[PDB]
């Protein structure tokens, strides 16, 4: 149920693990919905329904 756009799709270049509640656990070759992109860490959502921060270094602009 997609009401409208707000971010984009970004692929994970590398894997990571959520060491705190402010962050998330993601793997390379996965794609995530960004929500905020104005700083060093972007607010995205996993396909399982979980929101938090991940480093922009492992994120890349996916063409869809």
């Amino acid at each position: 149920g997609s009401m409208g756009t707000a971010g984009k799709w970004v692929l994970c270049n590398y894997d990571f693990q959520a060491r705190n509640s402010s962050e998330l656990s993601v793997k390379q070759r996965d794609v995530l919905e960004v929500l905020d992109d104005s700083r060093k860490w972007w607010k995205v959502r996993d396909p399982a329904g979980q929101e938090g921060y991940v480093p922009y270094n492992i994120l890349t602009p996916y063409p869809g």
Binding site: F16, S22, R39, K40, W41, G52, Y53, P55, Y56, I58
Partner: peptide
Amino acid sequence: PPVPNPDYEPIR
């Protein structure tokens, strides 16, 4: 070199 400078307004 992943994990850049610490982000503002955390979830904790």
